[PDB]
Amino acid sequence: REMESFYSELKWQEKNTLEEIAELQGDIRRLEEDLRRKMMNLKLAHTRLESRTYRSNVELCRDQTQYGLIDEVHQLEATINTMKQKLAQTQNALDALFKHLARIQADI
Amino acid sequence: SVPETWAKFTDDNVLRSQSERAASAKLREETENLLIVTANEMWNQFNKV
């Protein structure tokens, strides 16, 4: 009876765990394409700026737009650094599940 | 084709292959239940002898 009761709990834990593993793999593929998305916005601000340096003399006057784009590239770059650290966190929590998925299946 | 029809062709293409997996998943679960049972039924009869 004790042997049976522990087995049923072992199977219940495994079933709920392989629910979470497959579901968590969803958020990894959503994180990666947003991280790829933000690198496109960085390409725009660089291209927006160097074309605005074609201006000359009084055309080359500085303005709010130039200072505005200055703050965009710095802030867009910090966002990727934050997100890249968050992506590597989720991959760690995935790998912990796989090791612990084997150990529940090890004893079943 | 038009854009609305072109997407459906690709979407239903994966759904055929996706439904094949759930058809395949049942066979994997059904087969192991046979492997368990055949051992039990063979053991019970081997005991009666």
Partner: peptide, 15 residues
């Protein structure tokens, strides 16, 4: 489901 040591029910796919 059924515990492995009590399994005498065959599948419904071989009636």
């Amino acid at each position: 489901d059924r515990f492995p040591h009590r399994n005498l029910t065959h599948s419904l796919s071989l009636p």
